Design a protein around this ligand. Structure first.
Ligand SMILES: NC(=O)c1ccc[n+]([C@@H]2O[C@H](COP(=O)([O-])OP(=O)(O)OC[C@H]3O[C@@H](n4cnc5c(N)ncnc54)[C@H](O)[C@@H]3O)[C@@H](O)[C@H]2O)c1
Ligand SMILES: NC(=O)c1ccc[n+]([C@@H]2O[C@H](COP(=O)([O-])OP(=O)(O)OC[C@H]3O[C@@H](n4cnc5c(N)ncnc54)[C@H](O)[C@@H]3O)[C@@H](O)[C@H]2O)c1
Lengths: 290, 290
């Protein structure tokens, strides 16, 4: 019996698909940015807001909680109140619910931005955490609360930090922006910068697999970075998008984490950045139609 | 024009006394653990709850905010909701209010417990922060939020980590308990364990002088540990309490931060632990009369 908060969203729904195969799954989601159609039918969907509704009764008997729910991290035009509410408060309320209900296992999706302006790349898990963005700070705040509840109310946790996950059911970012442009005009793709900018992506299946793998970690609190073995330039992303869409437009030009910790434990990503991107472009295409 | 939250409390009142000598002070306090009588008469006392009221008219024109307000850190007998509301939520709401009012300088009293189980003593500011207590976690969360607001909304902050501050106006601590118990049976004092526990104490004036001194730090976010140069044993504390009370009961037996960063800056605590304790005891005896 496992509870998956945010199980109706991108990463969450994938987690549900994998766990539902051998666990009774209860999903808690207010569908603010999720889609109930993504939820496996073998699971029970409870439509509740972690920041305002009492959820201890939905946690009754649960052996573990995969806390995947959170506010969408956006570029700039961010709202402090929603980030606070859906990240900090929601997590605090969940921990209290877990405490009262007796649930002592939590798997949490943090974020690569807890490291702020890191001066060493690839960034290891023991690198200082001085977030500069509100989303990063909210997540580091969540990690602190989790850590303390683990020591104070005897819980065990697995915290995963990662940057950009792509794959079926996700709809935003560079790949999305390119598709929507080429749909708008198949003969020209605008690229901000000179395309030499680098990016790194982890394919969704690898994100899920890493989180499952890290569970063998047996410290009271286990922190792991998840990421790909490489990088990819925006210029190459554009080409792959054009390749899969079968196009040849005219191009108009206007935080890497170290995974050595998980790798010494025995995990390795199956896909590199280019493969993650190519598979993600195909699934996004069909996703937008579906 | 400076606003001091928690200005009716122990550390806060002393800050107000010192700052009022050359600045217009506005104290925001809900008089929970604080005493109105401790507020300097030259200051304006605004009775409000940081975690619930509209404090916009009060931050108007302020140059900086000394955020001293917070929940009492108790022993096992703590109220998560109270710690969350008076530390995390109050701080979030304050930062929002500051943002809205245009105040961009914040001085914050954090805590030594953000370091959890420090394995490096004297503990430096760059030591990892993995709190084991809800109080420590609540403060680390506050630090994260403050650091992100500084970077996102152009603010500058001075964060102070410390423990065991003693002196006039404080009523929580080993000294207070010893005097209280001694006031029952002046011929027999019960001391936990063999009382060989070392404990670094900082006298209130050194805490306040350190905070004022640290303002010289010119990074966007300045973090400093505060403390005295040494430690003192529990048994020794009991002795000094008796030495001052003029009693000779028989004893019935039932961490150190590095300040090299502030010292490099030119600050030095005036009193060692024994001196802070001796002065604090006399301060309390006289406090109990008022
Ligand atoms: N997608 C990425 O690239 C990425 C990168 C780093 C970290 N993360 C983290 O991974 C987690 C999942 O991200 P995602 O991409 O799948 O986003 P998402 O928006 O698809 O999934 C989050 C789900 O949480 C639910 N939710 C939000 N607030 C809620 C509340 N108060 N009560 C109940 N449900 C609530 C939403 O309805 C949504 O379905 C988040 O915690 C996020 O911070 C994602
Ligand atoms: N005294 C110590 O040994 C020590 C050690 C470490 C950290 N600190 C930190 O130093 C700061 C001051 O500690 P203190 O010893 O003076 O404690 P204190 O309890 O005397 O002072 C806190 C003040 O905050 C006010 N307050 C609390 N909640 C409030 C709210 N919601 N709205 C408005 N006012 C509110 C109280 O009325 C009180 O006057 C705190 O942030 C504390 O965590 C103190």
């Amino acid at each position: 019996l496992i509870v998956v908060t945010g199980g109706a969203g991108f990463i969450g729904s994938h987690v549900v698909d994998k766990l539902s195969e051998s666990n009774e799954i209860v999903v808690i989601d207010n569908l603010s940015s999720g889609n109930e159609e993504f939820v496996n039918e073998a699971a029970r969907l409870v439509k509740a807001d972690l920041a305002a509704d009492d959820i201890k009764d939905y946690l009754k008997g649960a052996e573990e909680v995969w806390h995947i729910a959170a506010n969408p991290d956006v570029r700039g035009a961010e709202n402090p109140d929603e980030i606070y509410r859906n990240n900090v408060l929601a997590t605090y309320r969940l921990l209290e619910a877990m405490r009262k209900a007796g649930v002592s296992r939590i798997v949490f999706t943090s974020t690569s931005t807890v490291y702020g302006e890191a001066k060493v790349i690839p960034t290891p898990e023991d690198y200082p955490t001085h977030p500069i963005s509100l989303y990063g700070a909210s997540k580091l705040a969540c990690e602190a609360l989790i850590e303390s509840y683990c020591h104070t109310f005897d819980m065990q946790a697995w915290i995963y930090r990662f940057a950009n996950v792509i794959g079926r059911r996700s709809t935003h970012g560079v790949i999305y922006d390119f598709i929507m442009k080429l749909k708008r005009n198949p003969e020209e793709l605008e690229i901000l910068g000179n395309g030499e900018q680098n990016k790194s992506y982890i394919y969704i299946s690898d994100c899920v697999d890493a989180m499952l793998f890290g569970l063998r970690g047996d410290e009271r609190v286990n922190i792991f970075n998840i990421g790909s073995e490489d990088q990819i330039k925006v210029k190459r992303i554009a080409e792959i998008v054009c390749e899969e869409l079968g196009l040849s437009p005219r191009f108009r030009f206007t935080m890497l984490l170290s995974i050595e910790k998980l790798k010494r434990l025995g995990w390795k990503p199956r896909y590199n950045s280019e493969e993650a991107v190519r598979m993600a472009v195909r699934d996004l295409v069909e996703d937008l139609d579906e």
